[PDB]
Amino acid sequence: PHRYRPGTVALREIRRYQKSTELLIRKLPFQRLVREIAQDFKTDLRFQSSAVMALQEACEAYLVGLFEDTNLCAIHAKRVTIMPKDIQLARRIRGER
Amino acid sequence: HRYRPGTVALREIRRYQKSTELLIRKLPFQRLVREIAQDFKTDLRFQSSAVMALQEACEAYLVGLFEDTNLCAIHAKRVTIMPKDIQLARRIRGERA
Amino acid sequence: SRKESYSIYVYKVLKQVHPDTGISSKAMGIMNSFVNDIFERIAGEASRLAHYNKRSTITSREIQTAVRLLLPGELAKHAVSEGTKAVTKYTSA
Amino acid sequence: RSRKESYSIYVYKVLKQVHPDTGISSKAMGIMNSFVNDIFERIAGEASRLAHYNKRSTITSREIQTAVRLLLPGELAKHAVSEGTKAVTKYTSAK
Amino acid sequence: AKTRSSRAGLQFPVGRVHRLLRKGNYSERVGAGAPVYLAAVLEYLTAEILELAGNAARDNKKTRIIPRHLQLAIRNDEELNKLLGRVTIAQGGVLPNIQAVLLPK
Amino acid sequence: AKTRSSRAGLQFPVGRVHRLLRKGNYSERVGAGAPVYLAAVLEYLTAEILELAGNAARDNKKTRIIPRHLQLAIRNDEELNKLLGRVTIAQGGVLPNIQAVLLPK
Amino acid sequence: KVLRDNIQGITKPAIRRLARRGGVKRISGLIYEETRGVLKVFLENVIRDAVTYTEHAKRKTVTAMDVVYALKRQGRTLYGFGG
Amino acid sequence: NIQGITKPAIRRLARRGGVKRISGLIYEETRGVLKVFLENVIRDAVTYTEHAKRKTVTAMDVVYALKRQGRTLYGFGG
DNA sequence: TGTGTTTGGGAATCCGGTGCCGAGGCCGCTCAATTGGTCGTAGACAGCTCTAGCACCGCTTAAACGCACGTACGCGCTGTCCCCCGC
DNA sequence: GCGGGGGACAGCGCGTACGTGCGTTTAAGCGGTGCTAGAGCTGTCTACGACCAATTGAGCGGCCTCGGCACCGGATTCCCAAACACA
């Protein structure tokens, strides 16, 4: 029939998403996650919709930057697959805890 | 007699992490700071404590940079630090574009 | 209640730069945020300089020093040039 | 002869409270002075921001408490709030 | 009565910047040339970014500037990138960039 | 006449902190309890650091605290380490730390 | 209703999409959980501050301005939501 | 004049960082980075001095120049 | 070809003497904190409006999930060659 | 500056885990409705903090002393690097 080689569609998806701007996390599950996290600090908290939007924007930006640094670390290790140790190294160097 | 390679490296690592004094010769660093400052304003004078502060800050910065470089080198499954490790650490830290 | 923005000034500047290009509302929001952020950076640095020179007024000199501290090389050069030009013209008239 | 301001004597009193048979070198006293000034400026600046944010004109103990919660890590913030509230309680209870 | 901005040849509001400086508790007193200098600097930076963003928008056959264009303008100019380095832009995306290792031989 | 610090049961100078708050242009007005609360917080933080530093000094058979002991105290306490993370301490040194990979088999 | 175990709403394809935006070509299988950890931490750090800023103002509702202010307090300023 | 930062000095700085083995090309890189850092600090320090009408760079100017980059330094009158 | 243990030997550590300089205490002074009192206003409180956050429902379809299948990348192993290390 | 040995880098194999694709399932997204908690604004009045003149003692500069710490040498100990006996 027809089947593309491994990694061709990966590059195609890289070009499509690095070219677009739309948010890559589903909005409703993220809203639920935010609410359930904030439930641990004060009960019965309401949120402006734009507050959750700002939180999602910030989280996606943070994760994209983190994935850039993870990919750099992985390439530095002569690998192509990113691994959790790459994430741990990137956050360790970045100064996060 | 001879010591096995890398053993004295470890001994000096312990020796220098145990201590606290400055690891750069004071007078070459003072000459370098004065030389650098000559490009910004001419005929400047430095209090000794000013040069001491600059030396302490620079040494701390370089030690932190070498910590990150060591992390990068271990990540690539090496023991020797290479200029690529410094560049990757500085790039992740956000200093190098 | 009244609301504060730099929308109209940014739009005027853009028309001075690219006379046939418009700008979204979202991009105007971002430009307003950027102008504010830079304003606070400069003003805070100038206040710091003034209090750490035991000095009580914020003059154009404090603003200029803050600009050299905040802006990168060529940007600081040109910004200082524009600021000096503006102060000279303002005081001449 | 200028006027110099420091926290050497108060830091020494706190040290005598904590470790009575223990002294502090002059370099360490300078470091502790720097630390105290740094923390003071951090807390005061955060409190000033909070006072401004709420379009508010006064820095009260509430702003200091909120700034302490914002800056210090959790357990440290909890103990710091306990100590500060205890101190203000004692200060206002007496007269 | 002619406004301070007009007398200085600017488009940013000198009087408004002066008011914010006074009502911002930066210092007890504010010189006359400080708001003029600050307004000139702000106007210059805004003009630079709007230049670059308009160029980027025209590079995409777009006649309006959107946050994506602002992000491309900022991230492509190295001194602007240094200035706005710790800043994230809503709906901004990232620069198209693929490591040369990941591309096929 | 009893001092404000005494009335609050503190050893840090409440009056001095109040003076610095007024003469620091943090706000136009300063509440009565603000210097007391702030002085209490500074005293508590100083007490924590002096605790940890005294312990570290006693760990080296030393009866005086030197910058090395303060540095070790800060870097060994995780909440203090978070607080003073971007801070470098003159004559402080670093924590003894060698990666487990570098040790010989 | 109680809100429980919503971290699984960050699905594997969403994490892959985020990695694609980051220029990543191959993703290990253990990445997805690690990411859900990192994200959960980031959120806790941001929300704790936003909630604090809301408590101080006596409000029961977290506004977008509190989130922006918490972010800039973490040195991670955000453009486009006011302020 | 950057050469005053000798090979053994960089070796010691790396040793304090826990580095066991150092390549031969590290030194010219390290010198470069350090020089850049110094220029970025000294520039600001000098700017503070020139703003203060002074001709002497004081340790306090250096402390504020370091705090500028978020490199707060304790122990020099800060 | 391999490796448990040996043992002289440099290198870090402990201990005692000593001396020296800064930390801790004491005194005289002064200036900044304290007291008491006046006065202005910042904000705490009540109270009122209206918006925008929450809860729910139904429907469509796009995305997530599970699974099959194959190949290509990670990782272990071997070799060599050279370039940092120890002196 | 030099001898050399370990590590970096090259090459190969293999095996399983990740990418691609297909069909099924699920819940996200959109719209539409309704309710009410709470955000935002306004008026009052009151307690609370700024300002000022007078008092004074707490803190700061200056001197002086001695003990904690640095330093030196001598003895103790503790990791070390192959060589040997023996598998």
Numbering used by the authors:
A (entry chain a): 38 to 134
B (entry chain e): 39 to 135
C (entry chain h): 29 to 121
D (entry chain d): 28 to 122
E (entry chain g), F (entry chain c): 14 to 118
G (entry chain b): 20 to 102
H (entry chain f): 25 to 102
Question: What does the original paper state about this entry?
Answer:
In chromatin, linker histone H1 binds to nucleosomes, forming chromatosomes, and changes the transcription status. Here we report the cryo-electron microscopy (cryo-EM) structures of transcribing RNAPII-chromatosome complexes (forms I and II), in which RNAPII is paused at the entry linker DNA region of the chromatosome due to H1 binding. The nucleosome is composed of linker DNAs and the nucleosome core particle (NCP), which folds an approximately 150 base-pair DNA segment into a histone octamer, comprising the four core histones H2A, H2B, H3, and H4. H1 binding to the nucleosome induces structural changes in chromatin, thus regulating transcription processes catalyzed by RNA polymerase II (RNAPII).
The form I complex is the predominant configuration of the RNAPII-chromatosome complex. In this complex, the globular domain of H1 binds to the DNA at the nucleosomal dyad (on-dyad binding). The structure of the chromatosome complexed with RNAPII is similar to that of the RNAPII-free chromatosome. The H1 binding restricts the orientation and flexibility of the linker DNAs. Surprisingly, we found that the exit linker DNA fixed by H1 collides with the clamp (the Rpb1 clamp core domain) of the RNAPII transcribing the entry linker DNA. The H1 globular domain does not directly interact with RNAPII. The specific interaction of RNAPII with the exit linker DNA would hinder the RNAPII progression on the entry linker DNA. In the form I complex, the H1 bound to the nucleosome restricts the linker DNA orientation, and the exit linker DNA is captured by the RNAPII DNA binding cleft. As shown in the form I complex, the exit linker DNA directly interacts with the RNAPII DNA-binding cleft, thus inducing the RNAPII pausing. Interestingly, when the Spt4/5-bound RNAPII structure was superimposed on the current RNAPII-chromatosome complex, Spt4/5 overlapped with the exit linker DNA in the form I complex.
